[PDB]
């Protein structure tokens, strides 16, 4: 057990297509799944989950290979990993549609599930990452202020396990720089939180898994070139950070190419790590979006 489980929640595992997936579940009612992104685990949702649980059954899986979940047996591309996450959600909501909230590469691993099974999805929240498509080839390698937002795409995807080799042994050094490079609010990342995240992803198979999601990114882009011929039909909300390290207006502008029904918000002075940097206003937005009209 890597992270504190909130009161009222359990920690559990389910096997899905031969892969043992760790998740954290609590609450009662219609299902909401929350999928974390790179450098983190289910724990980033730990302040949202109690609030959502008042009204929904909340499930927060660890991505395959990260946290306490086994690596995938098929592959790391978006379409393959979405199979694991879709089957997991559906174990818990076989008869009714469920809600999905995703952050960072959580988006990469849920988009194919969402687009191919639209009737299963009631509402969708995506924050702080591009859906894999050709727009990621337009991000700069370098800026007039220093390092750019996503130069790590090339670092993590490079051959000869370049990223693993250079980071092994120095995991906490790297993760703290990566988190703070992408943050506006550095305060909320205490020594304890940084340590907990560094321990999890420093597990040799978890460090490797992290980068496989990137080594599959170009394959995801190809997959989504075909899937994106069908627009998303469920009400959708995008959240992006407006401060240093966030995606700004890019999150909504991209989603105008995907969603029939999109609401967008840019949170001022917040970076990439929305649940931690700007917990209160992000929680308010997500709670209100999933509760309106219900």
């Amino acid at each position: 057990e890597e992270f504190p489980v909130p009161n009222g929640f359990e920690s559990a595992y389910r096997e899905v297509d031969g892969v043992k997936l760790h998740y954290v579940k609590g609450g009662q009612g219609p299902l909401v799944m929350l999928v974390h992104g790179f450098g983190q685990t289910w724990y980033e949702w730990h302040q949202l989950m109690p609030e959502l649980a008042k009204r929904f059954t909340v499930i927060a899986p660890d991505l395959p290979g990260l946290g306490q979940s086994e690596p995938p047996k098929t592959g790391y591309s978006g379409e393959q990993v979405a199979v694991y996450l879709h089957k997991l959600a559906r174990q818990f909501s076989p008869d009714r549609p469920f809600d999905l909230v995703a952050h960072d590469i959580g988006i990469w691993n849920t988009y194919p599930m969402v687009v191919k099974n639209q009737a299963d999805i009631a509402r969708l929240v995506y924050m702080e990452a591009p859906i894999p498509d050709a727009r990621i080839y337009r991000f700069p390698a370098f800026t007039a202020q220093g390092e750019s937002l996503v130069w790590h795409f090339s670092f993590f995807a490079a051959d000869d396990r370049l990223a693993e080799t250079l980071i092994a042994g120095k995991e906490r050094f790297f993760l703290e720089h990566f988190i703070k490079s992408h943050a506006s609010n550095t305060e909320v990342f205490s020594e304890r939180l940084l340590d907990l995240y560094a321990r999890s992803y420093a597990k040799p198979h978890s460090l490797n898994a992290s980068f496989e999601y990137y080594r599959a990114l170009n394959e995801s882009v190809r997959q989504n070139a075909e899937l994106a011929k069908t627009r998303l039909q469920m009400p959708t909300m995008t959240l992006a950070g407006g401060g240093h390290g966030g995606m700004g207006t890019f999150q909504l502008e991209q989603m105008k190419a995907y969603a029939e029904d999109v609401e967008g918000h840019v949170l001022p002075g917040c970076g990439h790590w929305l649940p931690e940097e700007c917990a209160a206003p992000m929680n308010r937005l997500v709670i209100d979006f999933l509760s309106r009209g219900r």
Partner: nanobody
Amino acid sequence: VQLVESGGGLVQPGGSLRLSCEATGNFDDRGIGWFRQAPGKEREGIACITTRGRTHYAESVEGRFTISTDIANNAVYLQMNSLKPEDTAVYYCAKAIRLTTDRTQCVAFPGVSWGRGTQVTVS
């Protein structure tokens, strides 16, 4: 383009008119809006419907126009009642987005190519 307008014409103020927007092929994506362009101003989104059925109306047509989707006949209709001189414009339908930022509006899907349109004149 792949949505064709029809139904426009000359009506007297206070009269009615039903515009239709017809699919030329596949009709899986029914997130469609109605746009009008006056000869002086610039094109404006006035009503849209998503495939799941959510509608939005611009304030200037709220309560007077009704957008609906007829799946059987691959069409989206725009029922216009209590027409007035201002409503005079060219009316276009295109693939659309129901966009909420600080308010909800109908916007065109990026990069759509517009078609002939259908002319509505109220006097």
